[PDB]
From a paper:
The leukocyte common antigen-related receptor protein tyrosine phosphatases (LAR-RPTPs), including LAR, PTPσ and PTPδ in vertebrates, and dLAR in Drosophila, have recently emerged as a major family of synaptic adhesion molecules. Recent progress in the structural characterization of trans-synaptic adhesion complexes, including LAR-RPTPs bound to Slitrks, TrkC, IL1RAPL1 or IL-1RAcP, have revealed the interaction interface of these complexes as well as the significant role of splice inserts, particularly that of MeA and MeB, in their selective binding.
Here, we determined the crystal structure of the human LAR-RPTP (PTPδ)/IL1RAPL1 complex and identified the lateral molecular interactions between neighboring LAR-RPTP (PTPδ)/IL1RAPL1 complexes in the crystal-packing lattices. Likewise, the binding of LAR-RPTPs to other postsynaptic adhesion molecules—Slitrk3 and IL-1RAcP (but not TrkC)—induces the formation of higher-order trans-synaptic adhesion complex assemblies. We also provide compelling evidence that HSPG, but not CSPG, inhibits the interactions of LAR-RPTPs with their postsynaptic ligands (Slitrk1, IL1RAPL1 and IL-1RAcP) and that HSPGs can even disrupt pre-established LAR-RPTP-mediated trans-synaptic adhesion complexes. Our results suggest that the competitive advantage of HSPGs over postsynaptic adhesion partners for LAR-RPTP binding can modulate LAR-RPTP-mediated synaptogenesis.
Numbering used by the authors:
A (entry chain A): 21 to 318
B (entry chain B): 27 to 349
Write the structure that this text describes.
């Protein structure tokens, strides 16, 4: 048997009226501790306050769904209670005056929009936020924060890499979508001045569907031809797929077809005045994949 | 990844232009998602391909450019002029053998509404305060502006040519009002000629009263007086709070109830609750609102002083009634 040990401690924060406020408090111990939230020293009991526990069993989240500012502008306490000991921690919740907000408060330029996705296919949610100190994007799923400690699994986080003067984009990408991912999704922009929440967006996972897209394959691969220095040759390379791939001719690591008129599906390399042996390669690329096949001229 | 690209769903920037207008859409990847020149991804061995789908969920297809109407230049696509058929989603994709990233750019081409010089769906929106200055600019015309040339822009109010008062400056691509009036609400259409094609941008201006230096006004209950209302224990009791709110920013007004010191959230149960901030009247951004406190079933403990509180950045006011 062990006393409670805090693994995650809530942090002070500043919200906005009508927004939401989420405090996280995780603790480990044997037996599993029980978490209790106190507002102004008073255990919370309210329609506006929802206490959602992790499926880990260790830890809980206090959610203030509407913020009223004078009411609930206060100091809150997370108390982890064990069979053998009690440990407590405290935080400050400032609900800022919706009239007065600092210039660089984090704002949601664009939230996540509702999405419906096939089973076992990657579903991605986008968020765009900005502030005078460039914010940090976190994600809450069904009132609980989404944890990707590192990119070990399917639910990866994508971060924009802007150079400045642009909104920041954070994306929640779900690879190999299980059935259990559907529900409310909220993007949170955290900043030193305050934190702001995006409007919720439901993810709906539905029926598996037919394979519409097929990766590119060579229908007519380039054929080897052996014409000697006098002659001229036309080499045809045709690749197909769904979508149809762009097909370009390369010699080694040099691009031979221009980037503005790259043809679709079929590219014919016309060679005049050839004199020396070459290893030309036809590259057929699409959004699904890239493939390359080599024709040798001797 | 080799098997699957990293899709950035759609970009925040949307292009919406009238048909017959030249427009240039550029890859959002270089301008917000990754830090790289276009010609710097090309040097590193990455290729730039464009796809087009008619809708957000519909299938993507390759594009073949002709160079005259639809020309692919650097990291952008040029439409000279756009056609109604050009609407849809244009996916910017950069990839090599192992890397792949893509994002979708929305492009909408439409006709202007019947009898007007703009499409109501495609408008800019700006706010302004009375007695103060407001500058409206013709936005998103960088590609048409020469720093050494005057754009010769015409401005219309309500799709009609009007005579503008000398208080409005009209310098280069901007219209500046030195002192705004409620008369100044409306739709401003900016029209610029470029290469024989007319480009337009339309802004709708909303006008409000200036930011208040005064606190809210308590109508009922009156402050500095105690109004009495007591009822039977069996029937319900309703208490309304009417307040006037000057324009302190387009925002939800701070009007709430308080019983002595409690916030009507502690012992409410299903018995006491607030009225949900009905908005009685408003004009020029000033709102007359009301919130009532209701005791549905009366008890002896409900009796006592109930105080309505009203607050903005300039101050607050409380007034109380008795049950
Ligand atoms: C958005 O709405 C506006 C409506 O205001 C529309 O553009 C406007 O009307 C027409 C468009 O065809 C253009 O005005 C032209 O003015 C020139 C002189 O500058 C005239 O020569 C033109 O008249 C010709 O057509 C007449 C039709 O019967 C003939 O009788 C006449 O002899 C001429 O051949 C023409 O009227 C101009 O583009 C504006 N004008 C003004 C005043 O704003 C626009 O087309 C709409 N957008 C779209 C995408 O349709
Ligand atoms: C394809 O492009 C990507 C992105 O430019 C290349 O990945 C970079 O490669 C080197 C070392 O691997 C570094 O510049 C970065 O650490 C890599 N970035 C990422 C995101 O992987 C990749 O090498 C390119 N592949 C080919 C074959 O050219
Ligand atoms: C500015 O343009 C809008 C339309 O783009 C006008 O809005 C219309 O106004 C009247 C009543 O308000 C009706 O014709 C429609 O119900 C409105 N349409 C829309 C889309 O709101 C508006 O009146 C114009 N402003 C001025 C001052 O004329
Ligand atoms: C309680 O009584 C008040 C006053 O009669 C109600 O407020 C009015 O409600 C009517 C009908 O919804 C509106 O037409 C008026 O504009 C309201 N006046 C104000 C100033 O709010 C209130 O709706 C009642 N609430 C309940 C549910 O009992
Ligand atoms: C390569 O393609 C071009 C265009 O389709 C053809 O014109 C070439 O063949 C022609 O054949 C001779 C008889 C003459 O008409 C001349 O114009 C071309 O060389 C073709 N070259 C091949 C297949 O070697
Ligand atoms: C073509 O490629 C093969 C294998 O990479 C190589 O052995 C051969 O020498 C090349 N020929 C020329 C002319 O580069
Ligand atoms: C981007 O391109 C310019 C030339 O157009 C170059 O001078 C500059 O160094 C590039 N930016 C880099 C390498 O960060
Ligand atoms: Zn008025
Ligand atoms: Zn008037
Ligand atoms: Zn007082």
């Amino acid at each position: 048997e062990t006393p409670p040990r805090f693994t995650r401690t809530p942090v002070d924060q500043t919200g906005v009226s009508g927004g939401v406020a989420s405090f996280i408090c995780q603790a480990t111990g044997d037996p599993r501790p029980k978490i209790v939230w106190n507002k102004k020293g008073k255990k919370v009991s309210n329609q506006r306050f929802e206490v959602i526990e992790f499926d880990d069993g260790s830890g809980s989240v206090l959610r203030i769904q509407p913020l009223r500012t004078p009411r609930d502008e206060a100091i809150y306490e997370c108390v982890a209670s064990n069979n053998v000991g009690e440990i407590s921690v405290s935080t400050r919740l400032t609900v800022l005056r919706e009239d007065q907000i600092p210039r660089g408060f984090p704002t949601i330029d664009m939230g996540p929009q509702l999405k419906v996705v096939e089973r076992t296919r990657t579903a991605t949610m986008l968020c765009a936020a900005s502030g005078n100190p460039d914010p940090e994007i976190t994600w809450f799923k069904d009132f609980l924060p989404v944890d990707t400690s590192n990119n070990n699994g399917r639910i990866k986080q994508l971060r924009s890499e802007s150079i400045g003067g642009t909104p920041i984009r954070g994306a929640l990408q779900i690879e190999q979508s299980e059935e259990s991912d559907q529900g409310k999704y909220e993007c949170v922009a955290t900043n030193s001045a305050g934190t702001r929440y995006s409007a919720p967006a439901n993810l709906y996972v539905r029926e598996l569907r037919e394979v519409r897209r097929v990766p590119p394959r060579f229908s007519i691969p380039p054929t080897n031809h052996e014409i000697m220095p006098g002659g001229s040759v036309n080499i045809t390379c045709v690749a197909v797929g769904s979508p149809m791939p762009y097909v370009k001719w390369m010699l080694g690591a040099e691009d031979l077809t221009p980037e503005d008129d790259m043809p679709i599906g079929r590219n014919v390399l016309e060679l005049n005045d050839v004199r020396q042996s070459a290893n030309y390669t036809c590259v057929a690329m699409s959004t699904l994949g890239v493939i390359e096949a080599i024709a040798q001229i001797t | 990844s080799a098997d699957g690209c990293t899709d950035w769903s759609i970009d925040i920037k949307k292009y919406q232009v009238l048909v017959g207008e030249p427009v240039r859409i550029k890859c959002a990847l270089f301008y917000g998602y990754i830090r790289t020149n276009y010609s710097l991804a090309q040097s590193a061995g990455l290729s730039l391909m464009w796809y087009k789908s008619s809708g957000p969920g519909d299938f993507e297809e390759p594009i073949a450019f002709d160079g005259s109407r639809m020309s692919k230049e650097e990291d952008s696509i040029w439409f000279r002029p756009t056609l109604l058929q050009d609407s849809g989603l244009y996916a910017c994709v950069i990839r090599n053998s192992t890397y792949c990233m893509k994002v979708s750019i929305s492009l909408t081409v439409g006709e202007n509404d019947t009898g007007l010089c703009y499409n109501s769906k495609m408008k800019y929106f700006e706010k302004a305060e009375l007695s103060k200055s407001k500058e409206i600019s013709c936005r998103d015309i960088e590609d048409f502006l020469l720093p050494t040339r005057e754009p010769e822009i015409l401005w219309y109010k309500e799709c009609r040519t009007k005579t503008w008062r000398p208080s409005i400056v009209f310098k280069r691509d901007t219209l500046l009002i030195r002192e705004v009036r409620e008369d100044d609400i409306g739709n401003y259409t900016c029209e610029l000629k470029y290469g024989g094609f007319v480009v337009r941008r339309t802004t709708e201006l909303t006008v409000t009263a200036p930011l208040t230096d005064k606190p809210p006004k308590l109508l009922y209950p009156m402050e500095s007086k105690l109004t009495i209302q007591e009822t039977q224990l069996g029937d319900s009791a309703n208490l309304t709070c009417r307040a006037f709110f000057g324009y302190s920013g387009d925002v939800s007004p701070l009007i709430y109830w308080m019983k002595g010191e409690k916030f009507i959230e502690d012992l409410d149960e299903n018995r006491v609750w607030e009225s949900d901030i009905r908005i009685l009247k408003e004009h020029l951004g000033e709102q007359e609102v009301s919130i009532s406190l209701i005791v549905d079933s009366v008890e002896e403990g409900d009796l006592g002083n109930y105080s309505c509180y009203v607050e903005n950045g300039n101050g607050r006011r409380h007034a109380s009634v008795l049950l």
